[PDB]
Design a binder for this molecule. Structure first.
Ligand SMILES: CCCCCCCCCCCCCCCCCC(=O)OC[C@H](COP(=O)([O-])OCC(O)COP(=O)([O-])OC[C@@H](COC(=O)CCCCCCCCCCCCCCCCC)OC(=O)CCCCCCCCCCCCCCCCC)OC(=O)CCCCCCCCCCCCCCCCC
Ligand SMILES: CCCCCCCCCCCCCC(=O)SCCNC(=O)CCNC(=O)[C@@H](O)C(C)(C)COP(=O)(O)O
Ligand code: SF4
Ligand code: SF4
Lengths: 176, 113, 381, 208, 114, 82, 96
């Protein structure tokens, strides 16, 4: 159940001693290393042509946050505050009140994307699939406060990315 | 058999393990005789040292002595006998067979609080 | 007089060297440069919330530290994962072991000067990060191994790709080993370097390869086994001289034996669920959260309060690729930990750095900091 | 209780109970409690004067042979007059076992350093100085290891706040990173998550 | 009410340790201003060391002043050995902080803090 | 180190370079604590200024007992011949 | 997989290994990115009878730690376990 690495004794006949001296004087394993590097010279490299080629992803990928709507335009979020209760970074801040038709909705839904650890506990705690961590990873900003999303930015992320978010949830919800 | 290496780094091969273990076990018992009889350390250490020493005196082979001392290679059995000897020499100075030096406070080991 | 150098932070490490010309008389590693106060932040967060901190301790051994924390919490909860979750944990733990040993060997070669097998083996490491992203959605910090099992079942066709990876990965190990093992320049940088005796390795709190390079036959997957490591068949590589070269060979052979374990885990994956079927610990399915009343109550209370862990203290240690990774978890009966000490092997290894670099030279210090696979996230917490 | 309940190991439980009796009767001078958890882990609660005699016993006695120091830990419990609880996790490779050795101190009583027994402690209890303020006597190099150099206070004490008292920022007047009193743009939101119903009747404490 | 000592047996051994620590700091301050190339005078650094010693002058417990001497030794070790940078030395001089309001009236004006 | 008047004038020169001591109020037999109104650390840095002038280490047990400059010059006379 | 047989033969000679059998670039042998939908199994507690939670409760069968010794004959000296069984050498590849 165990094996000894590096517990070989070299032979001491004239054959193997001359083999080790030929390896010393003729640099044979160094030529072996040159041969391996020369072998990789004549391979196709693994390099994709970004931005024109993209690395392969899965439908479970956890990128930029978005707030989804029902297929009637009504937003799914009903202010239950499970997502800021489970948020390990406390990146989510929610404030709510009943709006003009009596619906339980949020007035504040903020996600500090610089606090966020992108672990997706908010999408798996959400009982109505409102907050999702969608596919977008190319949302780098030139300013720190541009990574402090309010509810309007997250609803625009949902309206921007719903055509892809709904297909990823369709491909993945049976594992959940 | 002249075991070429112990396998453990920094632990050289002892050539005569039987006489070395007999000297170390009798020296453990000689140091251990200075402890009072009502101490449990003296009774337990005499018991395990007498079992090990009877096993050493029973077997001429090194390797079957390794398979029946049940402590690995014979050289780390020697090293553990040295550690036991130094321990007994410390236990004479510490005198830990005495009663408890201080009762703890009332909720000192109460968990949860 | 003698020389005193400060190899500063220009992970990261400050080193105060007392040299005597070319020799090294004293090596003082000033650390704390990545001390973030993880195990104080754990105290204000629940057990599920404290889980993603363990991804970021040994940030090349993510699912291993997830597994150690999950085993600590499941030990205090007196529950056990389902068998399929156990085989998935051992599978991704050995994939994590391949990740960590590629990082270890290729950066240890990069710092010495062999910069090429770095690029050769990070494509394989890129494919294993695609396996992590397929199983969890993130490439490094998955938050996948949870107390109760894992978070989500394997997507269909993942095991065929783990097969296609494992079939070809031994040739990658062979060409790494072609570049470095018989190479006389690599041997001249690692043979007489940092010889650690077995008694001082036991005394210094060393663990893993740092013990097994010195001939100590100790592996926690054999001796104190966890999830299904008593059901897989593998060998444990043992060194002979306690140097950098034996530890290199031990890590290459642990890649070999991890490939062996991954083949056995692909051939022996059982059917069944992946969480514990106690819905008071692991959350219910989303289809039954949205239909059952008990399951909605349990979803609410697990994702807001969390499960209450019974009061008690445990030290749960696993065999992470850097060695014995331990969690000393103290629970006071609430849904948040009272205390979580994180034992990591690199802390004791970097403590023994000063003995390992006595009588050596300045360019041997980088070889000794390489043979102890030191990720400063796990050292400084 | 077959699928979902962790199985009890009564063999290791009886063995650790016997060895706890063994350690309690060999060393009655310091051993104050001996307890075995329901998941079969042994704790030896000793007096702080016997840190060196207990740890050298378990390291050297041929039935113990706890050669490895896995972990060294302090725990802050402010409801005790000896608030700090020093935890030694020991590994025997000969007997494949683990033992916990627990002692105690307050802020001002020093604990004797176990670097004579296990040199691994040379950083660990050094960490306990940086994090808890527990002084260790006869330590070779006792100083801070994890916090910043001018840091006042000990962070893992539970009367110490989650954030510090000072925060750093670069100031361009003095051309220097400076420390200022901490002001958060958003307060850390304390959640009161404890359920008011009893979860575990086994751990029920008797009332007054 | 009988406690185990740290180094001192009463207050006089502790004042001996405080006195030798103050001597070592008083000798160190010119080297500290020199090799850190600080913008303070040597007299001003010595006044800061006098202020930091007189801040804790009310302590009548031998163990507490033992730990204060030990922590002053650790700060002096981090000052002699160049482990601190210029920023860590100058954190004793709270330069960029605003002057805090001292009387009742300005504290009434600026906020709610007593 | 030769003549006691030179050592006494040199001690007075050290004490008059010390800013906190009043030069008018300073005498040879004046006590540091209850006459001149000095802190203990004032007396400690006086002793360190004496070590700067005379160039020898004074221990702690015999620097606490130096409460007037007459005791200082007698200590320097007892650590020398004169 | 697009290399001509001259470059492929030079590459297999320079490496010394058969590289087309084990290529580190992935091709059509991988799984499809679109999969048929799963049907995950229920666990053992998805039953309508004999499924009381008081017979499968884990957190409430855990006990407080049993106190062996507290301060409020010729018995055998004991160890925390029997001594560790000596590891057998591998038969697969011991390098011996
Ligand atoms: C040695 C000197 C060069 C001799 C020609 C050569 O070796 O061509 C490479 C050619 C292709 O090698 P390969 O690795 O089998 O490539 C397979 C690819 O699938 C074949 O590549 P592909 O299928 O992807 O086809 C596209 C490719 C087709 O490839 C080419 O057109 C090859 C370049 C020809 C110039 O065309 C390009 O990418 C356009 C490249 C244009 C610039 C090429 C460099 C110019 C250098 C002088 C300035 O090499 C050989 O056929 C073997 C060696 C021939 C030696 C000839 C005598 C000397
Ligand atoms: C450049 C700046 C660097 C700043 C240096 C910071 C180091 C400060 C370390 C602080 C060390 C202390 O505070 S320990 C002193 C506490 N002592 C006491 O509580 C006992 C009372 N001590 C005193 O009154 C002291 O003045 C004396 C000199 C010992 C006795 O005077 P009394 O007699 O009349
Ligand atoms: S992904 Fe995680 S850290 Fe980010 S907002 Fe969601 S719960 Fe919070
Ligand atoms: S996003 Fe979901 S979890 Fe968060 S408050 Fe809205 S409905 Fe609740």
């Amino acid at each position: 159940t165990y094996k000894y690495v590096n517990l070989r004794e070299p032979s001491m006949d004239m054959k193997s001693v001359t083999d080790r001296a030929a390896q010393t004087l003729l640099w044979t394993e160094l030529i072996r290393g040159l041969g391996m590097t020369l072998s990789y010279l004549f391979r196709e490299p693994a390099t994709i042509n970004y931005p024109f080629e993209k690395g392969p992803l899965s439908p479970r990928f956890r990128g930029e946050h978005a707030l989804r709507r029902y297929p009637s335009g009504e937003e799914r979020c009903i202010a239950c505050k499970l997502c800021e209760a489970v948020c390990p970074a406390q990146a989510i801040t929610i404030e709510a009140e009943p709006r003009a038709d009596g619906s339980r909705r949020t007035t504040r839904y903020d996600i500090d994307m610089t606090k966020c650890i992108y672990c997706g506990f908010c999408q798996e705690a959400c009982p109505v699939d409102a907050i999702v961590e969608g596919p977008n990873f190319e949302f780098s900003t030139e300013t720190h406060e541009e990574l402090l999303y309010n509810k309007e930015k997250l609803l625009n992320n949902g309206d921007k990315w719903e055509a892809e978010i709904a297909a990823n949830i369709q491909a993945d919800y049976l594992y959940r | 058999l002249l075991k070429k290496t112990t396998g453990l780094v920094g632990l050289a091969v002892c050539e005569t393990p039987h006489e070395r273990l007999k000297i170390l076990y009798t020296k453990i018992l000689d140091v251990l005789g200075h402890i009072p009889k009502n101490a449990a350390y003296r009774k337990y250490t005499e018991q395990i040292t007498n079992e090990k020493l009877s096993i050493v005196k029973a077997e001429p082979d090194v390797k079957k002595l390794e398979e029946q001392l049940q402590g690995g290679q014979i050289e780390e059995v020697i090293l553990q006998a040295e550690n036991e000897l130094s321990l007994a020499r410390k236990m004479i100075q510490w005198k830990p067979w005495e009663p408890l030096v201080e009762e703890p406070p009332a909720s000192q080991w109460k968990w949860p609080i | 007089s003698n020389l005193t150098l400060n190899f500063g932070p220009q992970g990261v490490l400050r080193l105060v060297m007392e040299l005597s010309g070319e020799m090294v008389r004293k090596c003082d590693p000033h650390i704390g440069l990545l001390h973030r106060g993880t195990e104080k932040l754990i105290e204000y967060k629940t057990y599920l919330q404290a889980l993603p901190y363990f991804d970021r301790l040994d940030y090349v051994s993510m699912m291993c530290n997830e597994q150690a924390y999950s085993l600590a919490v499941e030990k205090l909860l007196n529950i056990q994962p389902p068998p399929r979750a156990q085989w998935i944990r051992v599978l991704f733990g050995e994939i994590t072991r391949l990740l960590n040993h590629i990082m270890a060997v290729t950066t240890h070669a990069l710092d010495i000067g062999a910069m090429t097998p770095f690029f050769w083996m990070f494509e394989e490491r890129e494919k294993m990060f695609e396996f992590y992203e397929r199983v969890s959605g993130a490439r490094m910090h998955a938050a996948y191994v949870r107390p109760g099992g894992v978070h989500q079942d394997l997507p269909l066709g993942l095991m065929d790709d783990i097969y296609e990876f494992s079939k070809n990965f031994s040739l990658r190990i062979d060409e790494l080993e072609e570049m470095l093992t018989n190479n006389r320049i690599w041997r001249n940088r690692t043979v007489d370097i940092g010889v650690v005796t077995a008694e001082d390795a036991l005394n210094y709190g060393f663990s893993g390869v740092m013990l097994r390079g010195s001939g100590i036959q100790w592996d926690l997957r054999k001796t104190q086994p966890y999830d299904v490591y008593d059901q897989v068949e593998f060998d444990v590589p043992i060194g002979s001289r306690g140097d950098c070269y034996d530890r290199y060979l031990c890590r290459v052979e642990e890649m070999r034996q991890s490939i062996r374990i991954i083949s056995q885990c692909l051939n022996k994956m059982p059917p069944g669920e992946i969480k514990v079927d106690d819905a008071k610990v692991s959350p219910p399915k989303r289809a039954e959260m949205k239909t059952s009343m008990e399951s909605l109550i349990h979803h609410f209370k697990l994702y807001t309060e969390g499960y209450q862990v019974p009061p008690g203290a445990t030290y749960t240690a696993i065999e992470a690729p850097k060695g014995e990774f331990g969690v000393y978890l103290v629970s006071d009966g609430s849904s948040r930990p009272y205390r979580c000490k994180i034992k990591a092997p690199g802390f004791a290894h970097l403590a023994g750095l000063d003995k390992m670099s006595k009588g050596h030279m300045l360019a041997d210090v980088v070889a000794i900091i390489g043979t102890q696979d030191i990720v400063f996230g796990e050292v400084d917490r | 209780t077959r699928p979902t309940v962790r199985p009890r190991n009564d063999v290791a439980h009886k063995q650790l109970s016997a060895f706890g009796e063994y350690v309690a009767e060999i060393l009655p001078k310091y051993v104050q409690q001996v307890q075995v958890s329901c998941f079969s882990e042994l704790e030896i609660c000793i007096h702080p004067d016997g840190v060196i005699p207990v740890l050298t016993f378990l390291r050297d006695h041929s039935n113990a042979q706890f050669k490895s120091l896995a972990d060294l830990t302090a725990v802050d419990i402010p409801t005790r007059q000896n608030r700090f609880e020093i935890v030694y996790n020991l590994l025997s490779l000969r007997f494949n076992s683990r033992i916990r050795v627990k002692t105690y101190t307050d802020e001002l009583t020093p604990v004797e350093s176990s670097v004579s027994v296990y040199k691994a402690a040379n950083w660990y209890e050094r960490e306990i100085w940086d994090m808890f303020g527990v002084f260790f006597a006869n330590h070779p190099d006792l100083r801070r290891i994890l916090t910043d150099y001018g840091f006042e206070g000990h962070p893992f004490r539970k009367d110490f706040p989650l954030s510090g008292y000072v925060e750093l920022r670069y100031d361009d007047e003095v051309k220097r990173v400076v420390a200022e009193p901490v002001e958060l743009a958003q307060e850390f939101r304390k959640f009161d998550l404890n359920s008011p119903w009893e979860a575990f009747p086994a751990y029920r404490q008797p009332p007054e | 009410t009988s406690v185990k000592p740290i180094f001192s047996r009463d207050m006089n051994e502790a004042k001996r340790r405080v006195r030798e620590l103050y001597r070592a700091w008083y000798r160190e301050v010119p080297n500290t201003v020199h090799l850190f190339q600080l913008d303070i005078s040597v007299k001003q650094g010595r006044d800061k060391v006098r202020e930091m010693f007189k801040k804790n002058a009310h302590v009548t417990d031998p163990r507490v002043v033992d730990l204060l001497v030990i922590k002053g030794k650790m700060e002096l070790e981090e000052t002699i050995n160049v482990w601190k940078q210029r920023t860590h030395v100058m954190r004793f001089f709270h330069e960029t902080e605003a002057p805090r309001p001292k009387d009742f009236l300005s504290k009434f004006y600026v906020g709610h803090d007593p | 180190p030769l003549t006691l008047e030179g050592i006494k004038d040199r001690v007075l020169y050290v004490l008059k370079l010390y800013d906190k001591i009043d030069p008018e109020k300073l005498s040879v037999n004046s006590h540091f604590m209850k006459d001149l109104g000095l802190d203990s650390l004032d007396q400690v840095e006086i002793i360190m200024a004496m070590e700067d002038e005379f160039g020898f280490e004074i221990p702690d047990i015999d620097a606490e007992k130096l409460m007037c400059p007459q005791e200082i010059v007698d200590y320097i006379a007892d650590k020398k011949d004169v | 997989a697009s290399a001509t047989r001259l470059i492929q033969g030079l590459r297999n000679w320079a490496s010394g290994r058969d590289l087309q059998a084990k290529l580190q670039l992935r091709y059509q042998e991988i799984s499809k990115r679109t999969q048929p939908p799963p049907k995950l199994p229920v666990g053992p507690s998805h039953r309508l009878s004999n499924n009381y939670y008081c017979a499968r409760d884990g957190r409430r069968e855990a006990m407080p730690p049993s106190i062996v010794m507290s301060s409020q004959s010729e018995k055998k000296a004991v160890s925390p376990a029997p001594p560790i069984k000596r590891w057998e050498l591998s038969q697969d590849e011991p390098y011996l």
